[PDB]
Design a binder for these strands. Structure first.
Length: 10
DNA sequence: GAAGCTTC
DNA sequence: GAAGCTTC
């Protein structure tokens, strides 16, 4: 997730 | 080490 | 199997 905590996604 | 799910 | 990097 994020970043941080990508997306999700990407 | 945990923290981090939603896509292609 | 690849695709997403940054936080705590």
């Amino acid at each position: 997730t994020x970043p941080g905590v990508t997306x999700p996604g990407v």
